[PDB]
Amino acid sequence: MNLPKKVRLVEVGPRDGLQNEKQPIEVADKIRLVDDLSAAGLDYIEVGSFVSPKWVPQMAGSAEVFAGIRQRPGVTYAALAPNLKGFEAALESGVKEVAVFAAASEAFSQRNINCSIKDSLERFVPVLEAARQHQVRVRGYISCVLGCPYDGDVDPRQVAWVARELQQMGCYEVSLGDTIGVGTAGATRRLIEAVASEVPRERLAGHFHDTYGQALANIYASLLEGIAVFDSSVAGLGGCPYAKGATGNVASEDVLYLLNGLEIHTGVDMHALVDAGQRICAVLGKSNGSRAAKALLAKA
Amino acid sequence: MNLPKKVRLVEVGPRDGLQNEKQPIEVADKIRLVDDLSAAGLDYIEVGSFVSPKWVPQMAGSAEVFAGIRQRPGVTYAALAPNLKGFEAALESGVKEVAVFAAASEAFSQRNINCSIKDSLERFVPVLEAARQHQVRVRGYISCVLGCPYDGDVDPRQVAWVARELQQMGCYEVSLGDTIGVGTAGATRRLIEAVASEVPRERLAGHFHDTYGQALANIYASLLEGIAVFDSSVAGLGGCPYAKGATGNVASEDVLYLLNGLEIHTGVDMHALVDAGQRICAVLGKSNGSRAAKALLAKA
Ligand code: NA
Ligand code: NA
Numbered sequence: 123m124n125l126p127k128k129v130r131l132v133e134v135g136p137r138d139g140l141q142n143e144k145q146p147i148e149v150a151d152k153i154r155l156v157d158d159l160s161a162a163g164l165d166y167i168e169v170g171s172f173v174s175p176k177w178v179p180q181m182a183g184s185a186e187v188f189a190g191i192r193q194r195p196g197v198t199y200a201a202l203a204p205n206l207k208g209f210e211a212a213l214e215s216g217v218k219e220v221a222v223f224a225a226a227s228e229a230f231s232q233r234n235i236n237c238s239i240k241d242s243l244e245r246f247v248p249v250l251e252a253a254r255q256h257q258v259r260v261r262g263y264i265s266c267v268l269g270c271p272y273d274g275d276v277d278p279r280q281v282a283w284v285a286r287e288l289q290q291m292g293c294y295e296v297s298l299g300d301t302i303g304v305g306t307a308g309a310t311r312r313l314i315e316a317v318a319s320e321v322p323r324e325r326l327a328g329h330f331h332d333t334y335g336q337a338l339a340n341i342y343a344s345l346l347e348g349i350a351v352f353d354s355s356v357a358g359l360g361g362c363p364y365a366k367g368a369t370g371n372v373a374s375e376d377v378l379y380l381l382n383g384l385e386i387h388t389g390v391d392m393h394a395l396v397d398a399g400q401r402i403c404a405v406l407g408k409s410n411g412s413r414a415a416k417a418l419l420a421k422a
Numbered sequence: 423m424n425l426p427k428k429v430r431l432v433e434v435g436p437r438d439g440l441q442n443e444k445q446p447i448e449v450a451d452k453i454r455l456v457d458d459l460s461a462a463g464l465d466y467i468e469v470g471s472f473v474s475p476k477w478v479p480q481m482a483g484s485a486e487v488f489a490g491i492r493q494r495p496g497v498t499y500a501a502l503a504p505n506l507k508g509f510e511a512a513l514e515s516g517v518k519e520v521a522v523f524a525a526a527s528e529a530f531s532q533r534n535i536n537c538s539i540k541d542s543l544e545r546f547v548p549v550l551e552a553a554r555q556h557q558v559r560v561r562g563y564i565s566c567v568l569g570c571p572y573d574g575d576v577d578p579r580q581v582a583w584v585a586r587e588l589q590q591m592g593c594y595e596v597s598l599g600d601t602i603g604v605g606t607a608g609a610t611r612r613l614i615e616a617v618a619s620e621v622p623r624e625r626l627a628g629h630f631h632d633t634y635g636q637a638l639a640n641i642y643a644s645l646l647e648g649i650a651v652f653d654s655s656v657a658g659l660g661g662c663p664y665a666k667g668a669t670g671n672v673a674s675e676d677v678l679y680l681l682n683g684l685e686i687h688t689g690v691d692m693h694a695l696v697d698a699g700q701r702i703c704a705v706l707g708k709s710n711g712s713r714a715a716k717a718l719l720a721k722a
Contacts, residue, residue: 336680
């Protein structure tokens with residue numbers, strides 16, 4: 123304390139949330155989601171993905187979403203670009219920021235995407251090069267930062283290594299992803315300390331799944347270490363494949379509740395945020411995955 | 423850090439959890455619950471209540487539960503005793519520890535129990551006197567420690583005052599109850615600091631509702647302040663009247679997950695704890711209210 127005075131909420135609801143929901147939704151409702159999120163005062167929203175809709179029907183129509191949304195000038199509207207043709211499709215949509223991904227666990231790399239950590243990093247060089255040419259900034263995600271669903275323990279120096287590779291490839295920010303939600307507050311702080319030996323805290327974000335109920339305590343522990351960017355999903359959209367669809371991403375309203383309570387500035391309006399989450403859950407619907415949102419809705 | 427090396431989990435599932443579930447259950451299943459909890463290695467279980475079953479059918483048969491459970495010698499099996507006749511009934515059942523209650527908010531006191539804070543404290547003097555005569559120890563709960571559902575902000579000095587009254591009346595331990603779940607990590611630490619001016623940390627416990635998703639972060643913040651006793655409900659039994667039955671007590675497995683992750687000793691076995699929670703939720707059932715338990719169950 124020693125806490126940040128200002129924090130960035132990275133809203134991944136429309137991409138990572140919707141992607142991990144079983145029910146695909148209409149382009150008109152995705153547009154409304156993003157527009158509701160922009161109305162909530164968020165300055166970073168992951169709008170969609172240029173993964174092949176063949177594999178992820180939930181992400182179909184991302185281009186139409188980009189064309190339909192009312193884009194506010196101070197807000198970044200990012201998209202996942204998993205390969206070159208995905209990047210090119212994103213370019214065609216006027217996307218100014220994309221995200222790529224890597225894993226801290228070799229075993230997880232082999233299982234999730236059928237190659238090693240290095241193979242996948244090298245696969246992304248072409249897209250870093252093209253993004254660099256078109257001045258599209260690239261965010262780098264790491265999975266398994268606090269443990270692997272196959273291998274168990276993940277050494278934080280291993281995470282530090284991949285974080286370093288990603289920043290040295292041209293990623294402007296590295297998102298540390300506890301992507302099975304197994305991490306606890308102390309290991310989280312040690313992880314930040316190990317990674318900060320290679321990449322400064324100001325290029326670091328925390329991406330904490332709430333599958334084991336640990337996400338907010340992890341965020342608080344992260345705040346204590348000076349991390350000021352956190353990825354969350356509005357109304358807790360949707361789940362985890364390793365825990366039969368139980369809770370995935372931490373819910374944005376839960377995080378905002380913490381941050382408001384700490385009197386930390388985010389620029390995000392709770393009522394509007396909750397309103398956005400409510401509308402999309404009804405479309406789904408899906409009972410709201412945010413405890414804070416439900417409680418606030420019940421209260422009103 | 424500066425963390426405790428050892429923490430007490432106060433299991434309130436059978437009383438506070440079951441009480442706040444809509445479905446009353448059979449005495450045979452309550453006995454099995456408590457027995458499963460004793461098998462999990464818990465050394466403190468709130469077994470039942472001697473509130474009038476007229477008002478709380480969920481608590482009917484508490485005496486039969488006490489008579490039926492296999493009581494392990496090193497374990498405290500506590501009961502709620504809301505008045506003198508409740509205490510006497512508890513005495514008749516061989517109860518060695520009871521809990522009384524108070525509120526940090528006058529407005530909440532008037533609404534919840536139709537008298538002031540002082541009126542209710544005085545009402546409890548007779549039961550403190552009788553418990554003192556029979557060497558039954560008394561635990562004191564405080565509600566609204568981090569905010570009141572009617573009044574809003576609760577000054578931590580006000581909580582400190584009631585904590586002091588309770589210890590000076592003969593309560594051996596005071597449980598600080600964020601009983602609407604509105605508290606956040608920073609206000610939690612300031613609360614502990616204010617209360618510790620009047621009553622030492624070693625007579626303090628944290629009773630954090632998870633209604634707003636804040637409970638574990640609050641517990642972590644509490645650990646950082648040296649609090650080493652936390653009240654939780656196995657499999658997150660059951661809810662909150664101020665949030666239309668949404669999450670009440672923090673779930674025990676969630677807390678244990680944190681504590682195991684911090685390598686803090688509790689003596690509690692996760693597999694057995696989860697097993698107890700699973701069995702009771704099926705009886706209810708009720709999908710498990712513990713994220714950690716669900717994730718662990720899915721994994722197995
Ligand atoms: Na994720
Ligand atoms: Na309670």
